[PDB]
Amino acid sequence: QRCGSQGGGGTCPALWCCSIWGWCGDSEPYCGRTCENKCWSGERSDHRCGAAVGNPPCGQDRCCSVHGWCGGGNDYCSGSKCQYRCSSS
Amino acid sequence: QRCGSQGGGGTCPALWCCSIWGWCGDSEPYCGRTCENKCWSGERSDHRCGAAVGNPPCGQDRCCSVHGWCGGGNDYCSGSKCQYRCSSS
Ligand SMILES: [Zn+2]
Ligand SMILES: [Zn+2]
């Protein structure tokens, strides 16, 4: 899926990272050094996530729980406990 | 100090746990299975704490920060970041 200034301005599904080349992913090429948006580095200082705080990203191997907190592991990342960037599932 | 039904009906200092014997603490006999009030099990799902949500407990090894949130580690528990149930170094 395309996204970003190169892809047309779409947002990635499950709010994944849009690389600078305009493609969606969740690995370093997309989320680290060559990320354009919803980058690992864009996680709020307070680590909250969700619609309440405008759907910000979470860092590497961290997901946005359904309670609105970024963090890692099943409790944040496994289905129904996870709202986006889910990665455990 | 004394708290709860056996101890006067007060809340502990630093909103710590009141055991079933009416004494204040922060270890498992106080906060765990034999806890009467402000127990580890009473953390709100939304993780809020502070007086605007009526001084809820925080879970185990979590502290209420000055920002109104329960969580683990130095953002919530360290000296100047913590308002109650503070414990980290
Ligand atoms: Zn939670
Ligand atoms: Zn932090």
Side-chain angles (χ1 to χ4, degrees), chain A residues 60-71:
Chain A
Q60 187 175 347
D61 301 313
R62 294 165 57 87
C63 319
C64 178
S65 66
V66 81
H67 287 147
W69 291 88
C70 288

Side-chain angles (χ1 to χ4, degrees), chain A residues 45-48 65 67 69 76, chain B residues 45-47 62 69-70 75-76:
Chain A
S45 45
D46 64 4
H47 310 311
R48 291 173 62 201
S65 66
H67 287 147
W69 291 88
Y76 291 76
Chain B
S45 52
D46 67 5
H47 303 199
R62 296 166 59 94
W69 305 109
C70 299
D75 293 17
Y76 303 82

Side-chain angles (χ1 to χ4, degrees), chain B residues 8-55:
Chain B
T11 304
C12 293
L15 284 120
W16 266 126
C17 315
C18 190
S19 81
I20 45 170
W21 305 278
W23 286 95
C24 288
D26 63 3
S27 50
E28 162 56 47
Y30 294 89
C31 299
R33 194 155 173 81
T34 50
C35 179
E36 172 196 321
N37 64 60
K38 305 300 185 176
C39 304
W40 286 333
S41 58
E43 192 177 308
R44 293 170 61 99
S45 52
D46 67 5
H47 303 199
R48 219 141 107 85
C49 61
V53 289
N55 300 318

